[PDB]
Design a protein around this nucleic acid. Structure first.
Ligand SMILES: [Ca+2]
Ligand SMILES: [Ca+2]
Ligand SMILES: [Ca+2]
Length: 223
DNA sequence: ACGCTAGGGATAACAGGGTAATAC
DNA sequence: GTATTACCCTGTTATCCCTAGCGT
């Protein structure tokens, strides 16, 4: 049995690396469920071959969250996060962190739920059949935000920024969320694009569901 | 008086492409 | 040389986040 330690620095097309990879078969329950929320939120699952293998690429401003996701996918992530320092078209420095897993057939199970012709889509029962409290918690740390950011406000309404999805797609998600978690949420608009509004009346319900998984440095997103 | 929104800004994300390091 | 592929890099906005001033 080869250990990550032994291959995390060898060339990409390295034999020992591939041997290490062959030792891995599937993603554990945690990596799968969290992945459903990550793909619905800020992650990117792609294939460079023709759907034979997929890998996941990450990028966030918050490094702690980044480190937390890498640890989650430890076995599939050979390197530490990498600082990316870029300059705007406004001459400003923008700092973020990047990371990725290597490609592996283990990721095909996640990818085939969303990808179709290398194009991302949300299927009609994704929520009902795969979205768990853990998935939802990650989807929240990703796309999640407050409805009212004003100070001293008591509004407990949550928002999921799903601006890249179609209205049909957002409808599948909303149906699943309402039926499965009794959440009182629905579609609203932002920059002419669909977002999911969760009424403050469902806050406590929403919170108890994702509480077990949000990390401390992400708590600031809650009301 | 003040809880709430819709309008909108400079990112903080997503998508793909290019290549240095192994194999044969 | 050609085939592989993890780790960067670059092209680009739909993102989360804010707040002027609207509604009651
Ligand atoms: Ca997102
Ligand atoms: Ca995010
Ligand atoms: Ca985006």
């Amino acid at each position: 049995n080869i250990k990550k330690n032994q291959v995390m620095n060898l060339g990409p097309n390295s034999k020992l690396l591939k041997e290490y990879k062959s030792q891995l078969i599937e993603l554990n329950i945690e990596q799968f469920e969290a992945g459903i929320g990550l793909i619905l939120g800020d992650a990117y699952i792609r294939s460079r071959d023709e759907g034979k293998t997929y890998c996941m690429q990450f990028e966030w401003k918050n490094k702690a969250y980044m480190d937390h996701v890498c640890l989650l996918y430890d076995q599939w992530v050979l390197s530490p996060p990498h600082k990316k320092e870029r300059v705007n078209h406004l001459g400003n420095l923008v700092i973020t962190w990047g990371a990725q897993t290597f490609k592996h057939q283990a990721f095909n199970k996640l990818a085939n739920l969303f990808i179709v012709n290398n194009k991302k889509t949300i299927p009609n029962n994704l929520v009902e059949n795969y979205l768990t409290p853990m998935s939802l918690a990650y989807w929240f740390m990703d796309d999640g935000g407050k409805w009212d950011y004003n100070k001293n406000s008591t509004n407990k309404s949550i928002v999921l920024n799903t601006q890249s999805f179609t209205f049909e797609e957002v409808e599948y998600l909303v149906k699943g969320l309402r039926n499965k978690f009794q959440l009182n949420c629905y579609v609203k608009i932002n920059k002419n694009k669909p977002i999911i509004y969760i009424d403050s009346m469902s806050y406590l319900i929403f919170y108890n569901l994702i509480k077990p998984y949000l990390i401390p440095q992400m708590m600031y997103k809650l009301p």
